[PDB]
Amino acid sequence: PQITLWKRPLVTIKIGGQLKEALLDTGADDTVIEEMSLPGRWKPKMIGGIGGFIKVRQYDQIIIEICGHKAIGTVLVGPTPVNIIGRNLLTQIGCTLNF
Amino acid sequence: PQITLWKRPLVTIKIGGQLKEALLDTGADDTVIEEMSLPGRWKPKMIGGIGGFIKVRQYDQIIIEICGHKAIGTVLVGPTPVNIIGRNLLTQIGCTLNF
Numbered sequence: 169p170q171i172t173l174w175k176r177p178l179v180t181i182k183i184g185g186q187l188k189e190a191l192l193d194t195g196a197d198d199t200v201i202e203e204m205s206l207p208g209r210w211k212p213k214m215i216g217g218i219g220g221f222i223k224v225r226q227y228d229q230i231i232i233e234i235c236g237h238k239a240i241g242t243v244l245v246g247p248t249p250v251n252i253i254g255r256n257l258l259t260q261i262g263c264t265l266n267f
Numbered sequence: 268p269q270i271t272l273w274k275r276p277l278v279t280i281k282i283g284g285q286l287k288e289a290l291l292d293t294g295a296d297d298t299v300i301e302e303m304s305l306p307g308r309w310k311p312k313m314i315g316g317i318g319g320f321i322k323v324r325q326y327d328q329i330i331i332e333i334c335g336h337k338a339i340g341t342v343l344v345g346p347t348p349v350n351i352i353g354r355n356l357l358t359q360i361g362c363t364l365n366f
């Protein structure tokens with residue numbers, strides 16, 4: 169698809185069998201999801217945003233469907249205001265910026 | 268152009284007669300630039316993201332040249348860690364997400 173930016177680029181994602189709404193975010197290096205349960209071990213990570221840093225849990229090799237495209241990669245879980253699909257997964261679905 | 272997302276989508280912009288590096292950010296509703304002087308009136312605003320909120324100065328009807336494309340709109344100025352080109356100006360240059 170071609171997504172214009174007059175509205176937030178929100179899409180449906182599927183993770184852990186649950187449908188959620190997430191933002192396709194070219195300004196985010198990483199993918200960060202609101203609190204949920206994910207399988208396996210997690211590692212600590214600090215991520216910096218507009219107002220400073222938040223502590224998140226890093227889960228690797230997580231299966232996530234984004235707007236119907238399958239991705240498998242790192243998902244961070246923490247106190248984010250919105251579910252964010254960052255560049256680590258936008259590259260897996262073949263996303264580019266065009267003008 | 269077509270910009271891939273293996274690295275941060277950083278571009279040169281010209282604003283208030285100055286050249287700066289900025290991130291093309293589909294996840295940002297607004298354009299936020301590091302501290303600089305801009306002409307005209309401003310009003311205070313709070314913008315939120317990962318890590319909480321920052322106070323910024325809102326300048327309206329500001330011209331920015333982004334990759335050689337001229338665009339006019341609201342520019343927020345404040346203590347952002349990175350210069351961000353948000354949707355308000357990405358739409359003006361005809362930027363879309365494609366996959």
Ligand SMILES: CC(C)(C)[C@@H]1Cc2cc(F)ccc2S(=O)(=O)N(C[C@@H](O)[C@H](Cc2ccccc2)NC(=O)O[C@H]2CCOC2)C1
Nearest residue numbers: 195196197198217218292294295296297315316317348349
């Ligand atoms: C959350 C929300 C509400 C959608 C925020 C929306 C938002 C809306 C605005 F009008 C103005 C600013 C911002 S924001 O700028 O706050 N932001 C945009 C986001 O792309 C950000 C850019 C950025 C800011 C500072 C440093 C580096 C990059 N990346 C980010 O937090 O990456 C983190 C997130 C995961 O990867 C690293 C997220």
Ligand SMILES: [Cl-]
Nearest residue numbers: 241242256257
């Ligand atoms: Cl990844």
Ligand SMILES: [Cl-]
Nearest residue numbers: 339340341355
């Ligand atoms: Cl605007």
Ligand SMILES: [Cl-]
Nearest residue numbers: 172173358361
């Ligand atoms: Cl359009």
